[PDB]
Design an enzyme around this catalytic site. Structure first.
Site, PDB file in Angstrom:
ATOM      1  N   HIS A 137       0.815  -1.283  -0.071  1.00  0.00           N
ATOM      2  CA  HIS A 137      -0.015   0.082  -0.230  1.00  0.00           C
ATOM      3  C   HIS A 137       0.828   1.348  -0.177  1.00  0.00           C
ATOM      4  CE1 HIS A 137      -3.440  -2.750   0.573  1.00  0.00           C
ATOM      5  NE2 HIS A 137      -3.183  -2.887   2.012  1.00  0.00           N
ATOM      6  N   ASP A 174      -2.325 -11.154  -1.844  1.00  0.00           N
ATOM      7  CA  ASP A 174      -2.805 -10.451  -0.790  1.00  0.00           C
ATOM      8  C   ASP A 174      -4.298 -10.155  -1.012  1.00  0.00           C
ATOM      9  OD1 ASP A 174      -1.947  -8.849   1.975  1.00  0.00           O
ATOM     10  OD2 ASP A 174      -3.670  -7.869   0.956  1.00  0.00           O
ATOM     11  N   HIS A 176      -5.982  -7.457  -0.079  1.00  0.00           N
ATOM     12  CA  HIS A 176      -6.152  -6.093  -0.291  1.00  0.00           C
ATOM     13  C   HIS A 176      -5.483  -5.671  -1.700  1.00  0.00           C
ATOM     14  CE1 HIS A 176      -6.495  -6.285   4.022  1.00  0.00           C
ATOM     15  NE2 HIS A 176      -7.354  -5.324   3.971  1.00  0.00           N
TER      16      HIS A 176
HETATM   17  K   LIG Z   1      -3.920  -8.104  -3.853  1.00  0.00           K
HETATM   18 ZN   LIG Z   2      -3.833  -7.462   2.863  1.00  0.00          ZN
END
Ligand SMILES: [K+]
Ligand SMILES: [Zn+2]
Ligand SMILES: [K+]
Length: 638
Positions: A137, A174, A176
């Site tokens: 991120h 992942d 996210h």
């Molecule tokens: K991902």
């Molecule tokens: Zn994650």
């Protein structure tokens, strides 16, 4: 050539933690690292890995992906007290700071670069970095979502700069979306970013419109960003494999990367409180395995998220097992992706159809929580048994071995001869049948041998003896993969055999337990076969879930055989017997190499014949109601 797997870890990265109440951040704990390493220790996996040391990323390395202003601000947090660190933390979204987190972020990044160097210098085949904080991120001038610096973005930019790589695949599994990575490479066609992620129609963090399937990149980068949003929770093994077979792998093998970097979050696993998905830890053994034939196996796995301490250890273990080359666990109960996943898959395939040859036929009308403990995975004493013709001496890899017909085995060949081939006395054939039975007994009734290759002269008797001997032992189900024309002594009427046939004569099949592929002659044979392999053969094989794979090649266009042999070992715990009709030292050498877990040479980056795509989609149409894992569109309801 390179061997071994690096495991890069350091207890220091567990020495920062959250120091105030914050429900949004309390899940990200030091114990994620300790539990993961300890799980690797318990199952003997850490001990089999080369423990490359952590280092600090330098300032210049951090500036590959981050701005001087952001680095300078983060560089001041070790001097801050708790009030000051709270205030600094609130300038960013879902992230906390700690006097030691800057130190640890530099180690997480350095550990990742150590992994890149170890792999690209051929000091190891592949590896994993267990790091904290995560990175995907993190953005040019912002910490975000527990991430300070973008570990995986560093690794790709570092691999471009110091090894002059032109094509890097990043796989972010992942749960996210890795928006820091997408932004970093948005306009870059040298770095292909794939991400699946919980999205729920943008209601799930980080709530970004550009996390949807329609963000394909920008400028020269259009088509090199692939988002697969999950719009419902509870995605299963079948959803994840449908994503791989029908989106990621077709693009990856066409892209032909020179390095694979996995942004490996295990919050996509069952039991995770953030992902709320239902895929079992065993799926990560196959996600790893299906990517290992890319880039000659050069794969750098980098830990991102994963928050259920129990599901976390098991998924880390499954990944490292595959990195070390241990046999993949069998996946049962696979079928169609759910409707929400098929909608996501359909939508990404359609928007990406402008950019990738696997999907281009879509663009025209004429063409268009508790779960069971994972079982033990053990490498076989000898992985691969080889039986060349009499007297032929080959140089074998250190985990292969020739094969000494015993007396009980010899009594079996005689019993079989008197009943079913009363007239056979050719003592060459009768030798081969003793070899087949001996190899199969070591593969199935023993943890000693995993797979094997036997060179044969007579196809019919050897195939009959191989198949029949495997069915009675019993192997509940047998997948037969046959390259050649004609008919075999293989009955596909009950539910026990599935026959894939790669042939030259365009035949018709009416049995839904058969997949017949007639690939037109020409220079397009490799792309078409790879397309059939990922989008038809693998989905059916995985849903069938055989107990043994029986490969068969007749003596009468096989620079794909190594890829198939490697990928098809995701079935039947790696238990594959290959019968080669006649001697070909190169084909026998390639077969043994792939069976033994050796690296396989890349194919080089092209487009298949439209007649072949039409032939393959007719097969999908004919088979997908029985075999739902073939589906890559939403079905029409009545
Ligand atoms: K991902
Ligand atoms: Zn994650
Ligand atoms: K990109």
């Amino acid at each position: 050539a390179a061997s071994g797997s690096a495991l890069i870890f350091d207890e220091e990265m567990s020495r920062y933690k959250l120091l105030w109440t914050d429900p949004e951040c309390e899940i990200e704990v030091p114990e994620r690292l300790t539990v993961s390493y300890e799980a690797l220790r318990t199952h003997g996996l850490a001990q089999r890995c080369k423990a490359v040391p952590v280092r600090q990323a330098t300032e210049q390395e951090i500036l590959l992906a981050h701005s001087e202003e952001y680095l300078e601000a983060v560089k001041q947090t070790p001097g801050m007290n708790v009030e000051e660190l709270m205030a600094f933390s609130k300038k960013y979204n879902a992230v906390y700071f700690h006097q030691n987190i800057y130190h640890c972020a530099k180690l997480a990044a350095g550990a990742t670069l150590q992994l890149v160097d170890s792999v690209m210098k051929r000091e190891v085949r592949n590896g994993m970095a267990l790091v904290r904080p995560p990175g995907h991120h993190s953005q040019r001038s912002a910490a975000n979502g527990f991430c300070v610096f973008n570990n995986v973005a560093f690794a790709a930019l570092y691999a471009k700069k110091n090894y002059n790589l032109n094509r890097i695949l990043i796989v972010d599994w992942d749960v996210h979306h890795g928006q820091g990575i997408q932004y970093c490479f948005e306009e870059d066609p040298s770095v292909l970013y794939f991400s699946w992620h919980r999205y729920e129609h943008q209601s799930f963090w980080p709530n970004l419109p550009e996390s949807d399937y329609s963000s394909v990149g920008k400028g020269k980068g259009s088509g090199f960003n692939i988002n697969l949003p999950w719009n419902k929770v509870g995605m299963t093994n079948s959803d994840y494999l449908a994503a791989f077979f029908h989106v990621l792998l077709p693009v990856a093998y066409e892209f032909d990367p020179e390095l694979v970097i996995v942004s490996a979050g295990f919050d996509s696993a069952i039991g995770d409180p953030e992902g709320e998905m239902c895929a079992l830890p065993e799926i990560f053994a196959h996600l790893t395995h299906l990517l290992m034939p890319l880039a000659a196996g050069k794969m750098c796995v980098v830990l991102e998220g994963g928050y259920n301490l129990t599901s976390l250890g098991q998924s880390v273990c499954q990944t490292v097992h595959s990195l070390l080359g241990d046999p993949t666990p069998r996946i049962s109960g696979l079928g169609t992706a759910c409707d929400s996943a098929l909608e996501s898959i359909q939508n990404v395939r359609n928007v990406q159809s402008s950019y990738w040859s696997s999907f281009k036929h879509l663009a025209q009308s004429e063409t268009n929580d508790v779960w069971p403990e994972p079982l033990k995975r053990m490498p076989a004493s000898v992985r691969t048994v080889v039986v060349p013709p009499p007297g032929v001496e080959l140089t074998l890899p250190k985990n292969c071995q020739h094969s000494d017909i015993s007396e009980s085995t010899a009594k079996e060949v005689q019993r079989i001869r008197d009943k079913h081939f009363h007239d056979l006395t050719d003592q060459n054939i009768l030798r081969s049948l003793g070899n087949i039975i001996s190899v199969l007994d070591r593969m199935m009734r023993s943890d000693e041998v995993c797979n094997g290759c036997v060179v044969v002269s007579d196809l019919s008797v050897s195939v009959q003896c191989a198949l029949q001997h495997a069915l009675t032992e019993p192997a509940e189900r047998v997948l037969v993969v046959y390259v050649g024309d004609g008919e075999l002594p293989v009955k596909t009427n009950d539910g026990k055999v599935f026959l894939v046939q790669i042939c030259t004569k365009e035949t018709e099949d009416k049995c839904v337990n058969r997949l017949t592929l007639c690939l037109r002659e020409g220079e397009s044979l490799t792309a078409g076969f790879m397309q059939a392999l990922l989008g038809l053969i693998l989905p059916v094989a995985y849903e069938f879930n055989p107990a043994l794979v029986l490969g068969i090649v007749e003596e009468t266009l096989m620079r794909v055989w190594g890829h198939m042999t490697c990928l098809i070992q995701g079935l039947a715990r790696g238990r594959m017997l290959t019968l080669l009709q006649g001697y070909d030292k190169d084909l026998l050498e390639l077969t043994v190499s792939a069976l033994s877990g050796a690296s396989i040479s890349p194919l080089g980056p092209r487009a298949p014949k439209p007649e072949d795509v039409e032939m393959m989609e007719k097969q999908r149409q004919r088979l997908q109601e029985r075999w739902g894992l073939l589906r890559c569109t939403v079905s029409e309801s009545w």
